[PDB]
Design a protein around this nucleic acid. Sequence first.
RNA 1: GUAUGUCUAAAUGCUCUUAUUUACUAACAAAAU
Lengths: 36, 198, 46, 97, 102, 54, 107, 54, 45, 114, 429, 107
Amino acid sequence: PQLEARSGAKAAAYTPTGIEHARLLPGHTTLKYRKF
Amino acid sequence: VWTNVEDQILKAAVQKYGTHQWSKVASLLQKKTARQSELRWNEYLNPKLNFTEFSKEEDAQLLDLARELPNQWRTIADMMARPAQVCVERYNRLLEDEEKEMLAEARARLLNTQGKKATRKIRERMLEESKRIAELQKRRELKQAGINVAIKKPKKKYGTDIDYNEDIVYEQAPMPGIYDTSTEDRQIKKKFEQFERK
Amino acid sequence: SGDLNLLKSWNPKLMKNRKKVWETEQDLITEQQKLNTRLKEIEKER
Amino acid sequence: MSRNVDKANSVLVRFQEQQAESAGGYKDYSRYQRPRNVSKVKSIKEANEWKRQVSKEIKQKSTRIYDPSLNEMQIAELNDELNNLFKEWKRWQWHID
Amino acid sequence: ILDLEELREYQRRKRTEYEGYLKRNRLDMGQWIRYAQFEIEQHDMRRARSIFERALLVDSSFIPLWIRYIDAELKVKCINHARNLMNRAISTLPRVDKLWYK
Amino acid sequence: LGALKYLPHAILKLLENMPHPWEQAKEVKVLYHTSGAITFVNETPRVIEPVYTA
Amino acid sequence: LFTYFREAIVATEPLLDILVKGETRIQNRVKLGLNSKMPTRFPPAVFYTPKELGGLGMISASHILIPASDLSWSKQTDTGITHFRAGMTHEDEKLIPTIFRYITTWE
Amino acid sequence: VDPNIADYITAKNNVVINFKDMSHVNKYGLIRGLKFASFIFQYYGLVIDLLLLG
Amino acid sequence: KIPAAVSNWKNPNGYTVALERNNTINDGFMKLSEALENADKKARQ
Amino acid sequence: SERKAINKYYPPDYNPLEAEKLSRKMAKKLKTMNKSHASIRLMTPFSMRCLECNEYIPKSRKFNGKKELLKEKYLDSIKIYRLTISCPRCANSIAFRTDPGNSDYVMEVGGVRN
Amino acid sequence: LHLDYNFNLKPTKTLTTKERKKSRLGNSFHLMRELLKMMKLIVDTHVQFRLGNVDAFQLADGIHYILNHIGQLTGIYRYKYKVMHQIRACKDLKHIIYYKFNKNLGKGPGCGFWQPAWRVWLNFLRGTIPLLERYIGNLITRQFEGRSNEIVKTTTKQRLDAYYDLELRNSVMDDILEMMPESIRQKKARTILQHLSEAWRCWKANIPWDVPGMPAPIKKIIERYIKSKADAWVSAAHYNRERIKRGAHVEKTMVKKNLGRLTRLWIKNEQERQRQIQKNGPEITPEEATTIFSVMVEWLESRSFSPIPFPPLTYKNDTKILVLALEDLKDVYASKVRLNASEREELALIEEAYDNPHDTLNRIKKYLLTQRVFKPVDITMMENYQNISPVYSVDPLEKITDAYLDQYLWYEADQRKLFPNWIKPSDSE
Amino acid sequence: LEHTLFKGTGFNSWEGLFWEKASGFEDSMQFKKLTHAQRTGLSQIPNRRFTLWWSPTINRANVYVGFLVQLDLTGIFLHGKIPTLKISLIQIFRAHLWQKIHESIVF
RNA sequence: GUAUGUCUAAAUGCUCUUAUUUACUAACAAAAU
């Protein structure tokens, strides 16, 4: 059948889409720091 | 009640299917039941079970067990490594058309590694091939007229792998580079023109 | 789900259809009986 | 109206088609059956369309009849169907214009 | 396979099929060699060469592919190219015995 | 098509400028894309609070 | 539930609460079918009306004014029946009778 | 009970339990489901009761 | 080298295969029996 | 746009009766609707053998059939239907009829029940 | 999909399924449409007012109606159901405003004073501005430039388990690769995976997964990963059960799985227990057992208990007993309309018994005498959501016999006073 | 009754009315299995018809938030998408029945 | 959840029938006293 297992994943870079994702929206702009 | 041909078929199915898949097997034997089939298998069919008799010592042991696990007979059987009913018995001691049709069916089943999707796909392929040959025939027929072979219609911007060369990877410019390769290629290609012509 | 045909009009094993058939038979049967008796009577007379 | 055919021949669609026919002259010569007796078609365009349709049909018939199970009787039947189609096409090539 | 156009049609189809099989199991390496062989048979040396290269790129650590490619190069009496290929292979993989031996 | 982005903003603006029942017809400031795609009522209606209440 | 513990329901408030909730859930199931649950569009008429007038013919135990109490002093110490809680629904002063009053207490 | 009956009971309790793909011989402990089992259970509990009382 | 296992639950291809698909018990199991039978005998007598 | 759509849009001039009449006028001309063997999806109750290639299509197997009306009804006012099927392997037209006297079907020059 | 000039969108024909699929607009577009409609309604009212069609007071009233009735007038709430809050607020305002406004004056239409409602709607719109700009804007972007390679997210309830399994498989493969040298390893990977799967299945079943060719290390690794899986699985199951007990948004399918999984676990536990028992004798020490037996005997003597004999052929009330049993059996089925094959068989058997009482009785007797081996009892477990119970389904043919025995033995006990007064469930009270 | 569509049927009064009466059906009733001749003497009221029966409460004007669509080729307002009701209405008013009624009255 | 895929060169008006449906879809869900 085609109900099939696998060998490897992927990572290929295209031109960015420019879509306004919900999570990507700004939040926690301030980074904290340590004392020293 | 169990006939021998049926039993044989069941055994075959089990080798084909799986000793924990008693629905398909049941279906295969039109009269016998799913839960019954498994039971039958347990009783007679499986080779690892020693349905045959054994020495006096074994018998003695069995009798001892019977005394000391009052007729807890499955347990006794397990202890023995024997089947149950047979053990119990030992302790106590001390139509044609249908067959033909079912067999035919069964044979068809067990052999054919097919279904909807397996059968369909191959058939589709065959059909496609036939179509292609028909097309070729048509072009042959209309050869005196100028005719072009129809391309596979594209779906979402794909490549026709004749032209263009597909995603090429380089020859990789090396140190001992010599220019005869090109000539050789040309020579090779010359022959194919001739082939095309004939 | 299992058996599809059970959700079809044309399927006779569907209960509604069966009922309809029975009704048809029952009416027709009754008519026949009514006529049959008459026929019998006629025969007797003859 | 499951399975699409019903939808196609739903009254609204039919009405729309009629409207189109009335205003602008959109017919679908696929959609109507081609007439049996030619010379009940005074317009040329319509005739041409009909001819085209028949040609298409013929082509379709041709495509299927060269399938691999050649000994089956359907193919044989089609051979006669094909002939009929051809005849029809020929007829459509009448010499009025 | 009577005419040139017919051949092209056939060949094209075959190529497409090969591509399709690759796209799923890119990391297979049996398919790639088969494809290469087919290309060689067709007598399009470029195409075959490209295919082999692609295969190598996918899996550089696969000696069989390398060796088959070398054979192909040599088969077409195209020694210099073959030599270059061999050299490349050696550079890639020293501690494999076989390339050197070849 | 692009203007859909700002159509809700436009709506909000227009609604905000609703002429009050003591007003026959309000003139209002308006920006509009020269293409004719969108039209924003530009002014934001402020009032003298007590007067408004009255 | 009620035939088994006829007398013993009245005292237990948790059980009553569950009944109220359970009944409501059941009602909503029906209302789920009708893809709404708008409280006006299902007056108790449609549920409790018997099947012999086209209703569902439920047998409510939900329209009871449940005993509320000082939960501060309820689990702790001692109790008395004061302050009734709502029971289940808005009513049009339609007192739907309760199955318990048609069951003879066990004693 | 009649010894034969007792034997029958005991064997009956001592069965191959199945579930989907796993199965096991119930070598110990009464199966509750089988019809007579209730009686057996009661009898067992009688013993317990006796023990409790004296 | 690792074998080619065959599932008792699954056959993707349906490829059939030629049937590829402790005795001591504790003192108790004798002792218990002895206790029981003997007890029974005692009861009888 | 959504399967549970309450009201389909009508043009501003849509005399419904008139529209219906028009449709009727253009129903005799129409290709589909003016034909027999209208399609249907059905499982096979008989569980039978395709007579050409002996393909054992079992009970409950799903097919895209053609239901056609048989003009000769059963008794008087209870219709019976021909239900065409194709065998999976060979493309032989199997079919069956639904004679409701026995509350069951009849085979129609397609295959045989077993 | 034709737009009215009132913004109520609806379809021209009835759409085929493909068309429908193509043309399902979503929560953005619909929201926008709703907004537009609302705008039109207020704008329309003002237009009307401007035209001689409607008085100033009337216009005001109309506006008020619109703002309160947004909810009924036009579906926003359908598409974004937090507009529900706004609607509620509007309603509240109306209630307040109307009661203030119609004090001495009576009930009727004509209350203006749309201000607070209007304000509320404006504020609602504020929130939307942002949401719509992300949503509608996004949609338009897609229309111009429609996404390349989206990434699904396993934090979803769905797909989690599968993903996990895949990950596990990958890990196992990696481990095996690390382990030893191979030539053409791709082929072997599949085999390894298969083996792993088999092992898992065995674990689930409680079969020992012993394969002879499996080399120690690889096998060991596989075992470890299946143990890990079990740990992850069992714990998960437990968690699910806990959730179910609480009443905490369990998926029907999930609940079913839990019921199944938990049942399996229970079965496994039982068989482990059995194994343990087999290994190390019964829990009961022999002396204790003997003592108990003695006690029982003493009790019997005290009671002067006539032991229950084997049913004779010419027993007085045998037929009656049989009939009772049959009736009982029927009462399992007499209610339900649906019957599986086994059930049907059982029914048939019962019928036969009824027909031929003497024969059946004889058969039963024979079975009692001889039959010491029996058909295997399949168990389903039932979902009493707090705590699952077992259900032991005995074979139809033996079942009748069992029923008969139950009927007979109990009757005998009743006659002969086996059970004393104090064991109450048995009693008819 | 006033909740229900009862008055819309055009009957004088609810006395001697029933549902799903049909003929007797027992002789040819052995196709079923442990059904006890008839499964239930109680009428099942399939919810398609239930909705219709209580249509005049279920669909009604005093709705909280129902978007009042006018049903296709009729004067039957639906305050929100209610599922089976609409279908029933369509069935009732098939073939432009409303128009026919109105025109008939006019005539 | 009303699947799907290949396949495509660029007679006119008339009326009469209805207290119905050769209706189609099953992706959806499945119990008693």
